[PDB]
Design an enzyme around this catalytic site. Structure first.
Site, PDB file in Angstrom:
ATOM      1  CG  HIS A 226      -2.000   0.879   1.169  1.00 56.22           C
ATOM      2  ND1 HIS A 226      -1.887   2.188   1.326  1.00 56.22           N
ATOM      3  CD2 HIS A 226      -3.380   1.112   0.835  1.00 56.22           C
ATOM      4  CE1 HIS A 226      -3.090   3.029   1.149  1.00 56.22           C
ATOM      5  NE2 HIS A 226      -4.075   1.911   0.899  1.00 56.22           N
ATOM      6  NE  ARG A 269      -6.146  -1.427  -0.400  1.00 55.26           N
ATOM      7  CZ  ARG A 269      -7.180  -2.095   0.394  1.00 55.26           C
ATOM      8  NH1 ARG A 269      -6.929  -3.401   0.298  1.00 55.26           N
ATOM      9  NH2 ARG A 269      -8.070  -1.481   0.832  1.00 55.26           N
ATOM     10  CE  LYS A 272      -9.914  -0.827  -2.848  1.00 58.28           C
ATOM     11  NZ  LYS A 272     -10.483  -0.300  -1.486  1.00 58.28           N
ATOM     12  CG  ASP A 275      -7.507   8.839  -2.154  1.00 54.90           C
ATOM     13  OD1 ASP A 275      -7.237  10.356  -2.211  1.00 54.90           O
ATOM     14  OD2 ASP A 275      -7.730   8.545  -1.121  1.00 54.90           O
ATOM     15  CB  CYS A 277      -4.380  11.596   0.245  1.00 53.30           C
ATOM     16  SG  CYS A 277      -5.203   9.844   0.210  1.00 53.30           S
ATOM     17  CE1 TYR A 278      -4.950   5.843  -2.256  1.00 52.26           C
ATOM     18  CE2 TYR A 278      -2.961   6.005  -0.471  1.00 52.26           C
ATOM     19  CZ  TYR A 278      -4.249   5.740  -0.984  1.00 52.26           C
ATOM     20  OH  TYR A 278      -5.125   5.129   0.011  1.00 52.26           O
ATOM     21  CG  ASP A 330     -10.850   9.990  -2.689  1.00 53.54           C
ATOM     22  OD1 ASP A 330     -10.291   9.803  -3.622  1.00 53.54           O
ATOM     23  OD2 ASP A 330     -11.680   9.475  -2.157  1.00 53.54           O
ATOM     24  CG  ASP A 337     -10.663  15.412   4.172  1.00 53.14           C
ATOM     25  OD1 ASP A 337      -9.356  15.126   4.273  1.00 53.14           O
ATOM     26  OD2 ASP A 337     -11.084  14.484   3.258  1.00 53.14           O
ATOM     27  CG  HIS A 340      -8.259  14.018   0.860  1.00 47.09           C
ATOM     28  ND1 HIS A 340      -9.283  13.329   1.754  1.00 47.09           N
ATOM     29  CD2 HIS A 340      -7.671  12.951   0.017  1.00 47.09           C
ATOM     30  CE1 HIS A 340      -9.159  12.117   1.614  1.00 47.09           C
ATOM     31  NE2 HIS A 340      -8.448  11.943   0.570  1.00 47.09           N
TER      32      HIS A 340
HETATM   33  N1  LIG Z   1     -17.008  14.870   5.502  1.00 40.58           N
HETATM   34  C1  LIG Z   1     -17.002  15.037   6.776  1.00 40.58           C
HETATM   35  O1  LIG Z   1     -17.916  15.183   7.670  1.00 40.58           O
HETATM   36  N2  LIG Z   1     -15.554  15.236   7.068  1.00 40.58           N
HETATM   37  C2  LIG Z   1     -14.492  14.948   6.002  1.00 40.58           C
HETATM   38  C3  LIG Z   1     -13.665  14.123   6.683  1.00 40.58           C
HETATM   39  C4  LIG Z   1     -13.276  13.931   8.047  1.00 40.58           C
HETATM   40  C5  LIG Z   1     -12.282  13.194   8.195  1.00 40.58           C
HETATM   41  C6  LIG Z   1     -11.116  13.173   7.624  1.00 40.58           C
HETATM   42  O2  LIG Z   1     -10.599  14.363   7.089  1.00 40.58           O
HETATM   43  N3  LIG Z   1     -10.250  11.871   7.533  1.00 40.58           N
HETATM   44  C7  LIG Z   1     -10.815  10.671   8.167  1.00 40.58           C
HETATM   45  C8  LIG Z   1      -9.652   9.743   8.929  1.00 40.58           C
HETATM   46  C9  LIG Z   1      -8.312   9.868   8.153  1.00 40.58           C
HETATM   47  C10 LIG Z   1      -7.279   9.170   9.051  1.00 40.58           C
HETATM   48  C11 LIG Z   1      -7.725   7.730   9.107  1.00 40.58           C
HETATM   49  N4  LIG Z   1      -8.405   7.218   9.866  1.00 40.58           N
HETATM   50  C12 LIG Z   1      -8.888   5.734  10.159  1.00 40.58           C
HETATM   51  C13 LIG Z   1      -8.197   4.835   9.207  1.00 40.58           C
HETATM   52 BR1  LIG Z   1      -8.898   3.006   9.037  1.00 40.58          BR
HETATM   53  C14 LIG Z   1      -7.473   5.420   8.077  1.00 40.58           C
HETATM   54  C15 LIG Z   1      -7.210   6.938   8.110  1.00 40.58           C
HETATM   55  C16 LIG Z   1      -6.339   7.084   6.837  1.00 40.58           C
HETATM   56  C17 LIG Z   1      -6.119   8.369   6.530  1.00 40.58           C
HETATM   57  C18 LIG Z   1      -5.362   9.107   7.486  1.00 40.58           C
HETATM   58  C19 LIG Z   1      -4.006   9.787   7.176  1.00 40.58           C
HETATM   59  C20 LIG Z   1      -3.347  10.373   8.129  1.00 40.58           C
HETATM   60 CL1  LIG Z   1      -1.661  10.966   7.960  1.00 40.58          CL
HETATM   61  C21 LIG Z   1      -4.055  10.746   9.567  1.00 40.58           C
HETATM   62  C22 LIG Z   1      -5.189  10.069   9.655  1.00 40.58           C
HETATM   63 BR2  LIG Z   1      -5.878  10.480  11.301  1.00 40.58          BR
HETATM   64  C23 LIG Z   1      -5.995   9.728   8.636  1.00 40.58           C
HETATM   65  C24 LIG Z   1      -7.844  11.186   7.542  1.00 40.58           C
HETATM   66  C25 LIG Z   1      -8.971  11.974   6.753  1.00 40.58           C
HETATM   67  C26 LIG Z   1     -14.149  14.277   9.033  1.00 40.58           C
HETATM   68  C27 LIG Z   1     -15.449  15.376   8.521  1.00 40.58           C
HETATM   69  C1  LIG Z   2       2.432   8.766   9.137  1.00 42.73           C
HETATM   70  C2  LIG Z   2       1.017   8.242   8.839  1.00 42.73           C
HETATM   71  C3  LIG Z   2       0.053   8.087   9.763  1.00 42.73           C
HETATM   72  C4  LIG Z   2       1.032   7.788   7.512  1.00 42.73           C
HETATM   73  C5  LIG Z   2      -0.402   7.004   7.258  1.00 42.73           C
HETATM   74  C6  LIG Z   2      -0.444   6.401   5.838  1.00 42.73           C
HETATM   75  C7  LIG Z   2      -1.649   5.832   5.247  1.00 42.73           C
HETATM   76  C8  LIG Z   2      -2.699   6.840   4.494  1.00 42.73           C
HETATM   77  C9  LIG Z   2      -1.839   4.482   5.171  1.00 42.73           C
HETATM   78  C10 LIG Z   2      -3.081   3.906   4.870  1.00 42.73           C
HETATM   79  C11 LIG Z   2      -3.945   2.848   5.577  1.00 42.73           C
HETATM   80  C12 LIG Z   2      -5.038   2.076   5.246  1.00 42.73           C
HETATM   81  C13 LIG Z   2      -5.718   1.028   6.156  1.00 42.73           C
HETATM   82  C14 LIG Z   2      -5.423   2.364   3.974  1.00 42.73           C
HETATM   83  C15 LIG Z   2      -6.681   1.338   3.026  1.00 42.73           C
HETATM   84  O1  LIG Z   2      -7.739   2.007   3.106  1.00 42.73           O
HETATM   85  P1  LIG Z   2      -8.770   2.209   1.829  1.00 42.73           P
HETATM   86  O2  LIG Z   2      -9.241   0.619   1.820  1.00 42.73           O
HETATM   87  O3  LIG Z   2     -10.226   2.908   2.545  1.00 42.73           O
HETATM   88  O4  LIG Z   2      -8.349   2.977   0.734  1.00 42.73           O
HETATM   89  P2  LIG Z   2      -7.600   2.234  -0.333  1.00 42.73           P
HETATM   90  O5  LIG Z   2      -8.798   1.619  -1.419  1.00 42.73           O
HETATM   91  O6  LIG Z   2      -7.130   3.552  -1.358  1.00 42.73           O
HETATM   92  O7  LIG Z   2      -6.538   1.367  -0.137  1.00 42.73           O
HETATM   93 ZN   LIG Z   3      -7.293   9.817   0.316  1.00 41.19          ZN
END
Ligand SMILES: NC(=O)N1CCC(CC(=O)N2CCC([C@H]3c4ncc(Br)cc4CCc4cc(Cl)cc(Br)c43)CC2)CC1
Ligand SMILES: CC(C)=CCC/C(C)=C/CC/C(C)=C/COP(=O)(O)OP(=O)(O)O
Ligand SMILES: [Zn+2]
EC number: 2.5.1.58
Lengths: 401, 315
Positions: A226, A269, A272, A275, A277-278, A330, A337, A340
């Site tokens: 990933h 990955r 999929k 997005d 953020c990637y 995304d 958000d 992103h």
């Molecule tokens: N539409 C709405 O109502 N909103 C917009 C979206 C917002 C959540 C958000 O920005 N989000 C949701 C939670 C994400 C969160 C995360 N949380 C759980 C899991 Br499983 C996986 C990941 C991967 C993305 C990632 C990456 C980093 Cl570095 C740090 C975080 Br803390 C994360 C961040 C973006 C809430 C408000």
């Molecule tokens: C330093 C730090 C905290 C870095 C975070 C790195 C990061 C964003 C990892 C992804 C974690 C994860 C479970 C993704 C799959 O979600 P998904 O199935 O919803 O999304 P996908 O289909 O694009 O893989």
């Molecule tokens: Zn994303």
């Protein structure tokens, strides 16, 4: 515009007349992206790729003070909101009033644990994700006040409390282990100069085990490759100077294969969806790989471009990832958000700025006001902030205990 | 007495008599708050009370029921999850009823790190993996690519040694969607941890299977990445029949994946002192330009790098 060329229509998915959930969802996305690409044609205006700076700025400066209850789901990731915002303001070249900066400092002080590291909000137990975010935010601010917030002796102590015999780190006490912890730890430890001789013993080897048959890196050994985990694994190795522990060639092929021929952005990955953020987690890997191979004295490397289509990525971000109201996303149809916004912007900056030794080469699609401040591919904060922070913490000796 | 957080008759904790003795502790955001969330009345109420019982480390049944509400308001709050596990051992709660609880919440929100880690802690405590493969299969039926679900699955299988029916489950999901890369990853996880890929019959069975899939869906990148992944090990040049067999699909099943695989086979032939070094190199370089300029332009920088790199190496 590469995306708008006629021959680009040839890059649409070919399902071989065998539909599955995968081909159906990809097609839905390509369909929606095509409507965006062709919007110019249908409305008869000249495509004007403009980064809505002022729109992004109001959104950012506002979120930095308060947020609606839609953010209750991020109540344990507040130091992240600080990092995401301050870093987005930083890429956009927007300043942090000394008053705002001190307020952010005071907040992170409340998030800091008496046991070292930061929690997701005032009084929360420390966790490595918000610890990484808290440290990065304080480095973007770069004042002596900010730097002093961090309790370096308790921080090192905290990192040791998470360290495992196999080389990995827990994300927090009583928590889970995955490649993110290695990066979060290597990032805060290097920036603050608290790396002892044995702190990361075995860590490079454990991360190397996360690299699988695909060439990319999974969260833990055995898992699917990933982008978020691969950036964490490689960036951590670069910090530890152990990039060679990975098969850099299989990784190069894997990450370059993640860029979508049609949409232009990167998927997380294989098989999929694309997005925004990637644009950072995946594209951010190319600069890291450039440096590593260059360290090995690779003679075939480019002297002007990263090993991905910088043009297509910038077009996907500029055309498809901006919310008119401000903020980035995304993909089209998704809500904006701060996460992103930060990574779409971070990836745009990576896409615009090439550099390898003495070589420097920009590629700014759309209006030149689009060019953003550069971002350090390892820490994802300004290169100046990195140099400034490390230089400062190097005046302090590594905590001995 | 679990008054649901969603129940129409749910009343704030501050309006609850069995809590009237304790004072809610509000959050200290500072005089000049940043990234300050305008909490809802309910969220604010539950957390002010959670802070109170946590600060006093009140290990009560009432505190236990409250963490459930705080978890439902924000399932990503790891501090609450910790305290919940603290109370699970103090109050000596039936861990099987807690498995019922975690089963529900995961069904509700499967993309959360805390919920899966908690389920793993419960399975470890009870040393009971009997519901796992089935629970996970139900989550994968909703999202066949859920990362945590696949991670939990790999953990249960390795920890408890439940390898026997996984390859069959993999075949099942591959039939549903031969493009599910998570399933291709699982296929490799199972095989490498059981028989391995050195067993020639397995390798043969795997390469043959993969080639059949390529024939059926030539543009499915997962099958191609898996083929490369299992042979790339010993070296693609080590398999002389493969190049031929692929060169045959040149007209019928010729995606830019077939093209890219040929360059890969060539790269390894060159490094492995093959016959016709000059010839083989020209074919590889020719394909790199076709890819860079025509067939796979998104990766032009990569293919040019490959071109240059191949030249420097095998001029
Ligand atoms: N539409 C709405 O109502 N909103 C917009 C979206 C917002 C959540 C958000 O920005 N989000 C949701 C939670 C994400 C969160 C995360 N949380 C759980 C899991 Br499983 C996986 C990941 C991967 C993305 C990632 C990456 C980093 Cl570095 C740090 C975080 Br803390 C994360 C961040 C973006 C809430 C408000
Ligand atoms: C330093 C730090 C905290 C870095 C975070 C790195 C990061 C964003 C990892 C992804 C974690 C994860 C479970 C993704 C799959 O979600 P998904 O199935 O919803 O999304 P996908 O289909 O694009 O893989
Ligand atoms: Zn994303």
């Amino acid at each position: 515009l590469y995306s708008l060329r006629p021959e680009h229509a040839r890059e649409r998915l070919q399902d071989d007349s065998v539909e599955t959930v995968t081909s159906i969802e990809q097609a839905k996305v390509e369909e929606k992206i095509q409507e965006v690409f062709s919007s110019y044609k249908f409305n008869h205006l000249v495509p004007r790729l403009v980064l809505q700076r002022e729109k992004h700025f109001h959104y950012l400066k506002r979120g930095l003070r308060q947020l609606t209850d839609a953010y209750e789901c991020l109540d344990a990731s507040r130091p992240w909101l600080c990092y995401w915002i301050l870093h987005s303001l930083e890429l956009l070249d927007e300043p942090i009033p000394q008053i705002v900066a001190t307020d952010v400092c005071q907040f992170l002080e409340l998030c800091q644990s008496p046991d070292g590291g930061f929690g997701g909000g005032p009084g929360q137990y420390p966790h490595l994700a918000p610890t990484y975010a808290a440290v990065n935010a304080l480095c973007i601010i770069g004042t002596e006040e900010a730097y002093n917030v961090i309790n370096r002796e308790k921080l090192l102590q905290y990192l040791y409390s998470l360290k495992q015999p196999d080389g990995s780190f827990l994300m927090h006490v009583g928590g889970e282990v995955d490649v993110r912890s290695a990066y979060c730890a290597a990032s805060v430890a290097s920036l603050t100069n608290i790396i002892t001789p044995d702190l990361f013993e075995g860590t490079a080897e454990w991360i190397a085990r996360c690299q699988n048959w695909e060439g990319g890196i999974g969260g833990v050994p055995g898992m699917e490759a990933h982008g978020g985990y691969t950036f964490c694994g490689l960036a951590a190795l670069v910090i530890l100077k152990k990039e060679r522990s990975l098969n850099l060639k299989s990784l190069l092929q894997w990450v370059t294969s993640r860029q979508m021929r049609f949409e232009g952005g990167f998927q997380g990955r294989c098989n999929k969806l694309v997005d925004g953020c990637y644009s950072f987690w995946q594209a951010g890997l190319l600069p890291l790989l450039h440096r590593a191979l260059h360290a090995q004295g690779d003679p075939a490397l480019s002297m002007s471009h990263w090993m991905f289509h910088q043009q297509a990525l910038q077009e996907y971000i500029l055309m498809c990832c901006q919310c008119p109201a401000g903020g980035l996303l995304d993909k089209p149809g998704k809500s904006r958000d701060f996460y992103h916004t930060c990574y779409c912007l971070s990836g745009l900056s990576i896409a615009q700025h090439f550099g390898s030794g003495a070589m420097l080469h920009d590629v700014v699609m759309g209006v030149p006001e689009n060019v953003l401040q550069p971002t350090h591919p390892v820490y994802n904060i300004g290169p100046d902030k990195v140099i400034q922070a490390t230089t400062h913490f190097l005046q302090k000796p590594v905590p001995g205990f | 007495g679990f008054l649901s957080l969603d129940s129409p008759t749910y009343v704030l904790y501050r309006d609850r008599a069995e809590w009237a003795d304790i004072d809610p502790v509000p959050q200290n955001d500072g005089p000049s708050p940043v990234v300050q969330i305008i909490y809802s009345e309910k969220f604010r109420d539950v957390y002010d009370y959670f802070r109170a019982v946590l600060q006093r480390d009140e290990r009560s049944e009432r505190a236990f029921k409250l963490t459930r509400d705080a978890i439902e308001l924000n399932a990503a709050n790891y501090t609450v999850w910790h305290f919940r596990r603290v109370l699970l051992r103090s109050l000596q709660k039936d861990l099987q009823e807690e498995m019922n609880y975690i089963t529900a919440i995961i069904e509700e929100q499967p993309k959360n790190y805390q919920v899966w880690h908690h389920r793993r802690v419960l399975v470890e405590w009870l040393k009971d993996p009997s519901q796992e493969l089935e629970f996970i299969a139900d989550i994968l039926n909703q999202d066949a690519k859920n990362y945590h679900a696949w991670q939990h699955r790999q953990w249960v299988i390795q920890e408890f040694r439940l390898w026997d029916n996984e390859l069959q489950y993999v075949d099942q999901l591959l039939k549903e969607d031969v493009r599910n890369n998570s399933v291709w990853n699982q296929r490799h996880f199972v095989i490498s941890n059981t028989t391995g890929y050195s067993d020639r019959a397995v390798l043969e069975r795997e390469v043959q299977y993969t080639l059949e899939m390529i024939k059926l869906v030539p543009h499915n990148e997962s099958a191609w990445n898996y083929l490369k992944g299992i042979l790339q090990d010993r070296g693609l040049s080590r398999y002389p029949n493969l190049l031929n067999q692929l060169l045959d699909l040149q007209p019928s099943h010729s995606s830019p994946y077939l093209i890219a695989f040929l360059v890969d086979i060539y790269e390894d032939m060159l490094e492995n002192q093959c016959d016709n070094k000059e010839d083989i190199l020209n074919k590889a370089l020719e394909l790199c330009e076709i890819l860079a300029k025509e067939k796979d332009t998104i990766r032009k920088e990569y293919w040019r790098y490959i071109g240059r790199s191949l030249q420097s190496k095998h001029s």
